[PDB]
Amino acid sequence: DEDETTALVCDNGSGLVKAGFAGDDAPRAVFPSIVGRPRHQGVMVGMGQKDSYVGDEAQSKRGILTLKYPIEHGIITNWDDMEKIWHHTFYNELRVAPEEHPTLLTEAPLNPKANREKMTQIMFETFNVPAMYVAIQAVLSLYASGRTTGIVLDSGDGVTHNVPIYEGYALPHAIMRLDLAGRDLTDYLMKILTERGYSFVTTAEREIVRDIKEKLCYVALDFENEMATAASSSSLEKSYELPDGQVITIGNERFRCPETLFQPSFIGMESAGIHETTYNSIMKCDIDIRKDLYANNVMSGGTTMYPGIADRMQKEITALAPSTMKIKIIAPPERKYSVWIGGSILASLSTFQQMWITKQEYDEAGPSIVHRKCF
Amino acid sequence: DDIYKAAVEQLTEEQKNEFKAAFDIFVLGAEDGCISTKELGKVMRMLGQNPTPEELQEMIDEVDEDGSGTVDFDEFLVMMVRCMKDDSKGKSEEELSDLFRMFDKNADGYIDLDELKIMLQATGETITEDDIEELMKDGDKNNDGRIDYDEFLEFMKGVE
Amino acid sequence: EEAEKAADESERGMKVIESRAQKDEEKMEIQEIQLKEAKHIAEDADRKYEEVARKLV
Ligand SMILES: Nc1ncnc2c1ncn2[C@@H]1O[C@H](COP(=O)(O)OP(=O)(O)O)[C@@H](O)[C@H]1O
Ligand SMILES: [Ca+2]
Ligand SMILES: [Ca+2]
Ligand SMILES: [Ca+2]
Ligand SMILES: [Mg+2]
């Protein structure tokens, strides 16, 4: 299927795995990060004895399979799910073995050392891979953006990373990760819908309402004013049609769901909102480059697909920062895949072909030394 | 459009007949007699893949030669032949420098129109004045009468 | 005899009418799937157009 000896770019982002060959502009195999496990034991004869579903095979059946998240906040919980999702991506979709081409994986900023050593060991010992490389997502996203300056805000599913890069320079001391993202928003919407009257307590419905949020939920331009005008609703409340057919009616809750990002007090945490944390990060940077960080801020992550985030960011930053300079916020189209796109354009360089880590040196050095070599 | 129209003209008559049949199939029952974003997306669904709307716009912009925002037969051939990437495998930077040097024979840092014309004359093919003007424009961006190295680099896209 | 003839005619009618019913059913699923896909992309396009209009403003 592939006639070019190039690394397979597999972005294992929290919530959605995006795998594809280098050189492409979009991932071909896109599936959620979920593992479905047979709950009961059947006396039936003939069905697949497979004890571990994955991807679309699990999405197609969520009532029988208990759903487990292979990644939580960033820390890898179960490694069997890791081996399952890579083995599946290798021998069920791409139809190619890892013994013929490299593999450029993308990991989140500020992750545990155990996670890195574990994935590297599974990719070297178990699977025969000629060479591995771990890369931070923020750099590849800035590559795909086509710039060298700005602060990347990557909001995945269970973690949110703010990474400032000015003139290509990474700042490992300022990268601050906060576990507020799509899962805590799904939980907030679920508890407020339970307060509305429709109560559910199973994961399949949680994924359904997550999809409903992805499709409908947006960000408000003025929270309190929308609350007042929605008190007497007319066009502000919408009636959604569940894929099963049950008629759901959702009004203001939509534009109050992502608001939890701006007010973490809703989930009883002393952490500051994403905008205030980004602002504090800007103060932690130097003054000289702060204006450039204001003018080149970039966004990444699937959570940014909601309509109305750019305007909300502009008003909040204008209210926090002075209103004398110019603070333009740029969001490139299809930003979610941009990271992966970067991977593709990063795997075609010959120099990058010279910066890989082969098996033998890793085996003698050991995983810890490999950690030192990368950084 | 260059490599696209080249591949189009490289097609055979039987292939072009199949292309016309497929076009009639795609515009079967349409209202504009061409393949617009709506009809292209309908075809993509009929196949299986789903195309982004902005992507559909950018694609129709990469195949049209008229300006209709829709794909006709003349553009159907381009939209059905663009698969092979002819302009890939860019020449090495040293080879590009050699190209610029031998096009800049008098050693000045600029490929004046005289050098381009003598080169076209030397190639042997019957050079049409329209071809000379189109290549001169494609190279010389600012239209100062010469193709510098940056404008020459710009001359390498769509070329292989 | 008369009853058997009538029953045979009725049975032939069953076969032909059921066959048409099966065809109409298949047509139902096909038409429904196309209609749903068309409505989904139409709603998507309308939402993107309204949003890009707001952005233009
Ligand atoms: N099309 C979409 N619309 C809205 N939200 C989305 C969409 N796709 C993903 N998300 C949200 O983004 C999160 C996953 O993001 P992720 O795939 O990790 O981004 P990235 O791959 O850029 O790191 C989930 O919480 C999900 O709710
Ligand atoms: Ca046209
Ligand atoms: Ca010259
Ligand atoms: Ca010039
Ligand atoms: Mg992300």
Q: A154 and A86: one domain?
A: no
Q: In this structure, are A133 and A210 located in the same domain?
A: no
Q: Are residues A197 and A257 in the same domain?
A: yes
| Backbone φ/ψ region at B89: left (φ over 0), alpha (ψ -120 to 50), beta | left
Query: Beta strand pairing status for A357-358 and A131-136?
Result: antiparallel
Residue A14 Cβ < 6 Å to ligand 1: yes
The H or E element spanning position A298 is: strand A298-300
Long-range pairs, B61-67, Cβ under 8 A, ≥24: B63/B4, B65/B1
Sort out which chain A residues have CB atoms less than 8 A from B54's CB and list them: 333-334
Do strands A53-54 and A71-72 pair parallel, antiparallel, or not at all (unpaired)?
A: unpaired
Question: Are A55 and A178 part of one and the same domain?
Answer: no
Same domain, A109 and A151: no
Interface touch B53/C44, C-beta < 8 Å: yes
Instruction: Say yes or no for a CB contact (<8 Å) between B53 and C37.
Output: no
Solved how? Answer: cryo-EM
Say whether both A206 and A292 belong to one domain: no
Q: What's the residue count for chain C?
A: 57
- A14 and A108 inside one domain: yes
- The DSSP element (H or E) to which A284 belongs, if any, is helix A274-284
The CATH number covering residue A251 comes to 3.90.640.10
Instruction: Report d(CA B132, CA B152) in Å as an integer.
Output: 15
Rounded-to-integer distance, Cα A230 and Cα A292, Å: 38
Tell me: do A60 and A125 sit in the same domain: no
* Whether residue A258 is found in the same domain as residue A367: no
Q: Which of A72, A94, A128 is the last residue of a domain?
A: A72
The total number of structural domains in chain A stands at 4
Q: Tally the C-alpha atoms within 13 A of residue C20's C-alpha that lie toward its C-beta.
A: 5
DSSP A37-82: EE-S----SSS-----EETHHHHT--SSEEEE-SEETTEE--HHHH
Distance, CA of B24 to chain centre = 25
Residue A180 and residue A151 share a domain? yes
Q: Check if B54 contacts A (Cβ < 8 Å).
A: yes
Closest CA to A185 of A222, A218, A226: A218
For A49, the domain range is: 32-72
Does residue B108 have a known ligand-binding role? yes
For B116-139, b/e burial (b = at least 16 CB within 10 A) is beeebeeeeeeeeeeeeeebbebb
Question: DSSP 3-state assignment of B100?
Answer: helix
Residues from chain A that touch B52, judged by Cβ atoms under 8 A, are: 334
**How much distance in Å is there from the Cα of A330 to the middle of ligand 3?**
42
> Does the CB atom of residue A214 touch ligand 1 within 6 A?
yes
Residue that terminates a domain, selected from A274, A301, A324: A274
Q: Please, are residues A122 and A79 in contact by the beta-carbon 8 Å criterion?
A: yes
Token readout for A306 is 């909601």
Residue A44 sits in a domain whose CATH number is: 2.30.36.70
Does one domain contain both A93 and A157?
A: no
Tell me the nearest-neighbour CA distance from A2 into chain B, angstroms: 14
Structure tokens at B127: 């050079």
Say if residue B151 carries a ligand binding annotation. yes
**CB A58 within 8 Å of CB A66:** no
**Alpha carbon of A29: minimum distance to chain B alpha carbons (Å):** 12
CB < 8 Å from B in window 302-361 of A: 333-334
Residue A332 belongs to domain with CATH number: 3.30.420.40
Q: Which of A105, A214, A341 to mutate to test the pocket of ligand 1 (most atoms within 8 A of CB)?
A: A214
A273-294 residues labelled b (16+ CB within 10 A) or e (exposed): bbbebbbebbeebeeebbebbb
Check if A13 has its Cβ closer than 6 Å to any atom of ligand 1: yes
For residue B51, list chain A residues with Cβ-Cβ distance below 8 A: none
Among the three residues A274, A293, A311, which one is the final residue of a domain in this structure?
Answer: A274
Is the CB of residue A196 less than 8 Å from the CB of residue A257? Answer: no
Resolution as reported, in Å: 4.8
- Give the integer Cα–Cα distance in Å for A57 and B1: 42
Instruction: Quote the CA–CA distance of A149 and A252 in Å, as a whole number.
Output: 37
Are A184 and A15 in contact by the 8 Å Cβ rule? The answer is no
Q: Could you tell me the two tokens for A15?
A: 């919530």
- Beta-bridge partner residues of A68: A35
Domain shared by A174 and A25, yes or no? no
